């Protein structure tokens, strides 16, 4: 269906400890494929997926040069934002940035992205029309006027309309076996007697990709979404994800509760009960 | 590929 490529950036200042720490990652859907850490013995854009090692040395030389330029620019922005907000130079501040593009099944662009944040709150972002900005405060409007005079959005619209969607299609083709093939979840239900008259039914969903999944319990036809303990989708570690939902069921009525799982890899939603 | 842009704030 719809696919996306994302690039995350994080810069945390280390006053007196040296250079600020810079960590950036790249994602195609929910799959990490590139990485660059400033605290590396030899910092270079490192691969994290098997279908990206196929690129030549000139590819990794550009991505490393670009990541190092983003690090040195973020290092200057950390000093600049101290003047915008009149903050002390002895405090640690965080600078975050994320840009990317979304494509649908037709291979065309759906939406471009470019957002920035300072100390966890929004700072300045590129609007959906790829031609205007949205500043969060008066200090962010200073950056807005400088980026509009330098025509920064003119390069962003060319990248998001062109280089972002074109390189995403070649990544989806080179990784067609992992990015375009969805892994259905492995489902099962466990029983845990909390007391002699009460029990808990837990519906499991393990080893699925992507992370988008919906676990909903139903008691003989009606959902108990309010009192269903659901945990956030967690990564298993091998590019797969896990999720479970639990309900406090009175003892003896276990066969009146059904679990419904929805995932893109399933042709139709599954229905599972305890099965003792 | 990444974005080739250098834009300080």
């Amino acid at each position, epitope marked *: 269906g719809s696919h996306s490529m994302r690039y995350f950036h994080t810069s945390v200042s280390r006053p007196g400890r040296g250079e600020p720490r810079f960590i950036t990652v790249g994602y195609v859907d929910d799959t990490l494929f590139v990485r660059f850490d400033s605290d590396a013995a030899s910092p270079r854009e490192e691969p994290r997926a098997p279908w990206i090692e196929q690129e030549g040395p*000139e590819y990794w*030389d*550009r991505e490393t*040069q*670009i990541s*190092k*330029a983003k*690090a*040195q*620019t973020d290092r*200057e922005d950390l000093r600049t934002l101290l003047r915008y907000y009149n903050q002390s130079e002895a405090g640690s501040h965080t600078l975050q940035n994320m840009y990317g593009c979304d494509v649908g099944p037709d291979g065309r662009l759906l939406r471009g992205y470019h957002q920035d944040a300072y100390d966890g709150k929004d700072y300045i972002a590129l609007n959906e029309d790829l031609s205007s900005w949205t500043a969060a405060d008066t200090a962010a409007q200073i950056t807005q006027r*400088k980026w509009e*005079a*330098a*025509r*920064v959005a*003119e*390069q962003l619209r*060319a*990248y998001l309309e*062109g*280089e972002c969607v074109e390189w995403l299609r070649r990544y989806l083709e080179n990784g067609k076996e992992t990015l375009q093939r969805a892994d259905p979840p492995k489902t099962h239900v466990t029983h845990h007697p909390i007391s002699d008259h009460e029990a808990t039914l837990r519906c499991w969903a393990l080893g699925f990709y992507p992370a988008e999944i919906t676990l909903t319990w139903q008691r003989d036809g009606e959902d108990q979404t309010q009192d269903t303990e659901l945990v956030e989708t967690r990564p298993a570690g091998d590019r797969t994800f896990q999720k479970w939902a639990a309900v406090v069921v009175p003892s003896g009525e276990e066969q009146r509760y059904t679990c419904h799982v929805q995932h893109e890899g399933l042709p139709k939603p599954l229905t599972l009960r305890w099965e003792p | 590929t990444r974005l*080739a*842009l*250098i*834009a*300080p704030k």
Partner: T-cell receptor, first 113, second 115 residues
Framework: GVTQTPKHLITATGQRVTLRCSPR?????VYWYQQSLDQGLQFLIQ???????AKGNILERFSAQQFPDLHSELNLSSLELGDSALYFC?????????????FGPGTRLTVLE | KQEVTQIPAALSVPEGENLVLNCSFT??????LQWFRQDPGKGLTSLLL?????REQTSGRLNASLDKSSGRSTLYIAASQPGDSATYLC??????????????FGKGTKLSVIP
């Protein structure tokens, strides 16, 4: 907007010259270039807000510095025959990759025996 | 690693003919591509600034292209007037060292639009 001083320079081998440059009022970055016949326009050094930003294959006997008033100077010591070329000065608003640089008229240097 | 190249060295063309100036650059993290004209006395004056991801830029009778895959650029001059006679330099801003960008120029093509 970019001005250079002096305009022309005729000197002998082994001497020292000083090239001054005043960027635009709104520009915080200064660039130094050398245009010779054998290599064309070659980048020397770049200063941004008083500190050195980028540096090419500039020789050790070429000294430069940006002052707090954003104007730059370039001292070429122990001049040789090969140093006879055109020295341009450029400036930009900042470090923006989507913006352009603005060159000055250029200082022509000629070193003789 | 970075070495821009322009071909041909010189070009003398009668007035009114359309022109094409080629430019080739080496594979690097280019940030933009410019075309400068160099007049005697006056310094360099920018004509077109092609962004990193852009493939075309136009302004009047000037139309320049950019192809990072092949690493070539082409400036199209229409209705060659005697005022267009100057040296046309092909400049690119490539990522150099570690985090720095350096504007690299080509040898240049001197033009003489014979009226």
């Amino acid at each position: 907007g970019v001005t250079q001083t002096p305009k022309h320079l005729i000197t002998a081998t082994g001497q020292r010259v000083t090239l001054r440059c005043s960027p635009r009022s709104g520009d915080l970055s200064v660039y130094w270039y050398q245009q010779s016949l054998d290599q064309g326009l070659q980048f020397l050094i770049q200063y941004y807000n008083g500190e050195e930003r980028a540096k090419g294959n500039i020789l050790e006997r070429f000294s430069a510095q940006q002052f707090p008033d954003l104007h730059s100077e370039l001292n070429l010591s122990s001049l040789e025959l090969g140093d006879s070329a055109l020295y341009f000065c450029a400036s930009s608003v900042g470090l923006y990759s989507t913006d352009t640089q603005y060159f000055g008229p250029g200082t022509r240097l000629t070193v003789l025996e | 690693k970075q070495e821009v190249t322009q071909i041909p060295a010189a070009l003398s063309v009668p007035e009114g003919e359309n022109l094409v100036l080629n430019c080739s650059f080496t594979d690097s993290a280019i940030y933009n591509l410019q075309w400068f004209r160099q007049d005697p006395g006056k310094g360099l004056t920018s004509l077109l600034l092609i962004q990193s991801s852009q493939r075309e830029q136009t302004s009047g009778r000037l139309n320049a292209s950019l192809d990072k895959s092949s690493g070539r650029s082409t400036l199209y001059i229409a209705a060659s007037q005697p005022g267009d006679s100057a040296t046309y330099l092909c400049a690119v801003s490539l990522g150099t060292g570690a985090g720095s960008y350096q504007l690299t120029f080509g040898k240049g093509t001197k033009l003489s639009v014979i009226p």
